[PDB]
Write an enzyme that holds these catalytic residues in place. Structure first.
Site, short mmCIF file in Angstrom:
data_model
loop_
_atom_site.label_atom_id
_atom_site.label_comp_id
_atom_site.label_asym_id
_atom_site.label_seq_id
_atom_site.Cartn_x
_atom_site.Cartn_y
_atom_site.Cartn_z
N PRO A 136 0.91 -1.27 -0.11
CA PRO A 136 -0.26 0.01 -0.03
C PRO A 136 0.92 1.31 0.07
CG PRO A 136 -0.88 -1.50 1.55
CD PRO A 136 0.23 -2.23 1.06
N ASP A 137 0.29 2.22 -0.60
CA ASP A 137 0.75 3.55 -0.50
C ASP A 137 0.48 4.27 0.60
OD1 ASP A 137 -1.44 4.93 -0.84
OD2 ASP A 137 -1.49 5.32 -3.02
N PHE A 138 0.72 5.76 0.76
CA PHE A 138 0.68 6.39 1.89
C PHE A 138 -0.76 7.08 2.12
CE2 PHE A 138 4.60 5.77 4.35
CZ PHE A 138 5.56 5.46 3.33
N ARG A 139 -1.06 7.70 1.06
CA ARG A 139 -2.09 8.84 1.23
C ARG A 139 -3.30 8.44 0.20
NH1 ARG A 139 2.68 11.20 1.19
NH2 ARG A 139 3.22 12.39 2.98
N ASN B 229 10.92 5.80 -1.87
CA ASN B 229 10.52 4.59 -1.27
C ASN B 229 11.61 3.53 -0.63
OD1 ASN B 229 7.93 4.82 -2.74
ND2 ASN B 229 8.53 3.39 -4.16
N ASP C 184 11.26 0.22 0.40
CA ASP C 184 10.84 -1.12 -0.01
C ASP C 184 12.06 -1.89 -0.54
OD1 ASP C 184 10.62 -0.42 -2.81
OD2 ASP C 184 8.51 0.21 -2.60
N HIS D 20 14.38 8.94 0.55
CA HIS D 20 14.01 8.92 2.04
C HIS D 20 14.51 7.99 2.83
CE1 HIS D 20 10.16 11.47 0.80
NE2 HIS D 20 11.18 12.07 0.65
N1 AR6 Z 1 -0.72 1.53 -9.17
C1 AR6 Z 1 -0.42 2.95 -9.17
N2 AR6 Z 1 -0.38 3.46 -10.42
C2 AR6 Z 1 -0.44 4.91 -10.58
N3 AR6 Z 1 -0.32 5.87 -9.35
C3 AR6 Z 1 -0.63 5.16 -8.34
C4 AR6 Z 1 -0.58 3.80 -7.97
N4 AR6 Z 1 -1.04 3.43 -6.77
C5 AR6 Z 1 -0.93 4.56 -6.12
N5 AR6 Z 1 -0.94 5.68 -7.05
C6 AR6 Z 1 -0.79 7.23 -7.07
O1 AR6 Z 1 0.72 7.27 -6.42
C7 AR6 Z 1 0.89 8.46 -5.17
C8 AR6 Z 1 1.15 7.71 -4.27
O2 AR6 Z 1 1.42 8.78 -3.21
P1 AR6 Z 1 1.51 8.90 -1.68
O3 AR6 Z 1 0.97 7.72 -0.92
O4 AR6 Z 1 1.48 10.25 -0.89
O5 AR6 Z 1 3.18 8.26 -1.70
P2 AR6 Z 1 4.51 9.25 -2.03
O6 AR6 Z 1 5.64 8.28 -2.37
O7 AR6 Z 1 4.09 10.34 -2.76
O8 AR6 Z 1 4.84 9.80 -0.47
C9 AR6 Z 1 6.21 10.54 -0.23
C10 AR6 Z 1 6.49 10.40 1.25
O9 AR6 Z 1 5.21 10.78 2.13
C11 AR6 Z 1 5.40 9.90 3.31
O10 AR6 Z 1 5.39 10.60 4.68
C12 AR6 Z 1 6.74 9.00 3.24
O11 AR6 Z 1 7.74 9.67 3.91
C13 AR6 Z 1 6.67 8.96 1.62
O12 AR6 Z 1 8.21 8.92 1.41
C14 AR6 Z 1 -0.48 8.90 -5.05
O13 AR6 Z 1 -0.82 9.83 -6.25
C15 AR6 Z 1 -1.75 7.50 -5.94
O14 AR6 Z 1 -2.87 8.04 -6.50
#
Ligand code: AR6
Ligand code: AR6
Ligand code: ZN
Ligand code: ZN
Lengths: 299, 301
Positions: A38-41, A112, A114, A131
Site C-alpha cells: 500500500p501507498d501512504f495517502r 520508497n 521497499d 527517504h
Molecule cells: N498503481 C498505481 N499507479 C499509478 N499511481 C498510483 C498507483 N498506486 C498509487 N498511485 C498514486 O501514487 C501516489 C502515492 O502517493 P503517496 O501515498 O503520497 O506516496 P509518496 O511516495 O508520494 O509519499 C512521499 C512520502 O510521504 C510519506 O510521509 C513517506 O515519507 C513517503 O516517502 C498517489 O498520487 C496515488 O494516486
C-alpha cells in the site's frame, strides 16, 4: 519547445531523438502498490488511513522524529510490516532497469524504502534513496550517532524490544528519513549536478506532497519535458494557504500556457507498457519481467 | 548574482539603502512585529496562540484555522474570534518604521501575514499594503455558488451574540475574510507579487518564522542580486533541508555559509532592530517623534 505535442506519443518521439540523452526518474509509493505494498495517502487503502490501532494524534506522527522520541512503540510495531524482502518488483521498476540498460538513466530518485529498485537491478550509482534505507540504523543522539547493522535492528524489531543504543542508551532507529530529519548527503550532492543536465523527467507514483522531494521537479531546466505517470494529477493545483509546492513550482498540464508537462493518468505498470510499446521496447520489457520474476521464484 | 552589500551587516544594509541603487524596498512581515504591542504570535513556546488552545479540544492547533474543520466544527473559531478582533492595541515602533519608509518614498509594498490592522493604524494605505492572509474587515458566505458579502458590524453582532453566522440567502456559514488553511489567498496577493518583485532593490523581512506557503516563497521571488535583511528574534528561512521543510529546496536564506553574499540576520527585538537601522540612516529622531505623536493621538481620542 522540445515536445511536438503534449501526449505520451510526443514524449516517446522526443525520447527516440538525439536530444534525449539523460532521463531522471522521480518515484514514490505508487510504483509499488501493484506488488502488494500500500501507498501512504490513497483513501482507505493508504497507510495513513490504517493507523487507528496506534491512537496517534494524527497519522503522520508515526514517521515524525519528535513524536518518535516521545512514543517510539507504534513505529516499531509497524516496522515489522515495513521491513523489505517479501515482494517482487513491478513492471514500472523493470522499465527503469530498461532505461539503465539503454544508457538513458541518469538517476532514479526514490522516496520508497521497499528496496524494489535494487531488487529490480538498479545499482547504487543509479540510485538516490531520498527517504533513506532500512539497511543501516543510527542512535538518534547527535553527539553519539552509533551505527548498527540491519541484523541488529531486525533482531530488535522482530523480538518486540525497543532498540536502545549500547553506548548512550538513546533510541536507535533505521535510517529511514522521518519528518524533521535531514535527508542523506547523497541527495544533495547528486541533485546539484544531475538537474543541470537532465533531458526528461519521468515522475511516477507520487502525490508530490512532501518537501524537499517535491521541489525536484522545479530544479530541472525550464525546457526539460516532464511526464507524469500516476492515478491522479499531481503537482498541478491552484495555490492555497498551506500548499506544499513553492509558488510557481508545480506542473502545468492543462493551462493555455502548458508547453512541456504531460499527465498520463492510470496505473504505473500500464503507463510503462504503453510507453515501452511506443518506443519498440514492449517485448524486451515483458521478457525482462518474466525472466527476473522467474529468477526470484527460483529460490 | 552581483554583490551589492559591501559587508553582510546592518551597517552594510544602511549604506546600501543610502546609495542610489536602492530605490524600491519590500517589507515581508508577520506576527513578531506585533508582540510588543501585546498581541501574542502563533508559534512561540508558551506565549504563542498555538500553545494555548487546549480548551477547544482540537486534533492539532492549526485545526482552528483549517477550512474543513471549520465547516464541520465552527464553534471553536468563533469563540476564539472575540479575542482576534482588531483595534484594542497601538502600532509598534516597527510599524512606524515602515510608515517612515513610505514617507521617504522607499516603500514599494508591505506584504503582511497579520490580520491585526496595525499597518493601517500606523498610516500605511491600501495601496502600500498586501494583506496576504486576509482581513476581518469584510466577511463572506462560504458557498462558492453564492459568496454573499457581509459588513464588519454584521460579523461583530454574530460573534459577540455567540450565534454562528449564517448566510441570509443560502444559509451556509459566513466567516471573516481571513485566509484559512486550504483557502485561496486574495487576488491582490498574486497581482501585486507578479510585478513588485521584478525590480525590488531590498527585502526587509521582520517578525516571521516563514512557516507557511505561499508567503514563504516570496523571498525567492526577488532577483538574485537583491539584498535581504531579516530582523527577527531567531533565524528563519535558513536551515538544513529536512523532510517536511516548508521552504522549497534552495529557496531559503543564506546567512552563515561560505557562499553567503546578500542575506543579513539581525537577531533580537523587531522594535530594537528598526531603531538601530533608523540610527544608521539618520532617522532616529524622526522615528521617535512620529511614534510619540501617533501614540498620543490614539490616546487623545
Ligand atoms: N498503481 C498505481 N499507479 C499509478 N499511481 C498510483 C498507483 N498506486 C498509487 N498511485 C498514486 O501514487 C501516489 C502515492 O502517493 P503517496 O501515498 O503520497 O506516496 P509518496 O511516495 O508520494 O509519499 C512521499 C512520502 O510521504 C510519506 O510521509 C513517506 O515519507 C513517503 O516517502 C498517489 O498520487 C496515488 O494516486
Ligand atoms: N518582539 C519580537 N521581535 C522579533 N521577533 C519576534 C518578536 N516576537 C516574535 N518574534 C518572532 O516572530 C516570529 C513569529 O512567527 P509565527 O508565530 O510563526 O508567526 P507568522 O506571522 O510567521 O505566522 C504566519 C502564519 O501562520 C499562522 O498559521 C497564521 O496564518 C500566520 O499568518 C517567530 O520567528 C518569533 O521568534
Ligand atoms: Zn548512542
Ligand atoms: Zn450564501
Amino acid at each position: 519547445r522540445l515536445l511536438d505535442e503534449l501526449t505520451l506519443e510526443g514524449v516517446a518521439r522526443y525520447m527516440q531523438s538525439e536530444r534525449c540523452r539523460r532521463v531522471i526518474c522521480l518515484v514514490g509509493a505508487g510504483i509499488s502498490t501493484s506488488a502488494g505494498i500500500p501507498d501512504f495517502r490513497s483513501p482507505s487503502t493508504g497507510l495513513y488511513d490504517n493507523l487507528e490501532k496506534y491512537h496517534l494524534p494524527y497519522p503522520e506522527a508515526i514517521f515524525e522524529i519528535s513524536y518518535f522520541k516521545k512514543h517510539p512503540e507504534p513505529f516499531f510495531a509497524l516496522a515489522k510490516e515495513l521491513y523489505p524482502g517479501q515482494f517482487k518488483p513491478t513492471i514500472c521498476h523493470y522499465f527503469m532497469r530498461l532505461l539503465k540498460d539503454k544508457g538513458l538513466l541518469l538517476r532514479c530518485y526514490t522516496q520508497n524504502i521497499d528496496t524494489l529498485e535494487r531488487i529490480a537491478g538498479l545499482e547504487q550509482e543509479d540510485l538516490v534513496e531520498a527517504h533513506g534505507t532500512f539497511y543501516t540504523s543510527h542512535c538518534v543522539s547527535a553527539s553519539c550517532r552509533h551505527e548498527y547493522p540491519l541484523s541488529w535492528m531486525k533482531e530488535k524489531i522482530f523480538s518486540e524490544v525497543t532498540p536502545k543504543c549500547e553506548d548512550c542508551q538513546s533510541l536507535v532507529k533505521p535510517d529511514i528519513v522521518f519528518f524533521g530529519e535531514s535527508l542523506p548527503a547523497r541527495f544533495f550532492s547528486c541533485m546539484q549536478s544531475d538537474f543541470l543536465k537532465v533531458d526528461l523527467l519521468l515522475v511516477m507514483g507520487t502525490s508530490l506532497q512532501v518537501q524537499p522531494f517535491a521541489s525536484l521537479i522545479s530544479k530541472a531546466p525550464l525546457s526539460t519535458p516532464r511526464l507524469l505517470i500516476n492515478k491522479e494529477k499531481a503537482g498541478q493545483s491552484d495555490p492555497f494557504l498551506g500548499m506544499i509546492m513553492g509558488l510557481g513550482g508545480g506542473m502545468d498540464f492543462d493551462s493555455k500556457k502548458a508547453y512541456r508537462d504531460v499527465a498520463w493518468l492510470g496505473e504505473c505498470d500500464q503507463g510503462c507498457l504503453a510507453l515501452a510499446e511506443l518506443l519498440g521496447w514492449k517485448k524486451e520489457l515483458e521478457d525482462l519481467v518474466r525472466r527476473e520474476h522467474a529468477s526470484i521464484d527460483a529460490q
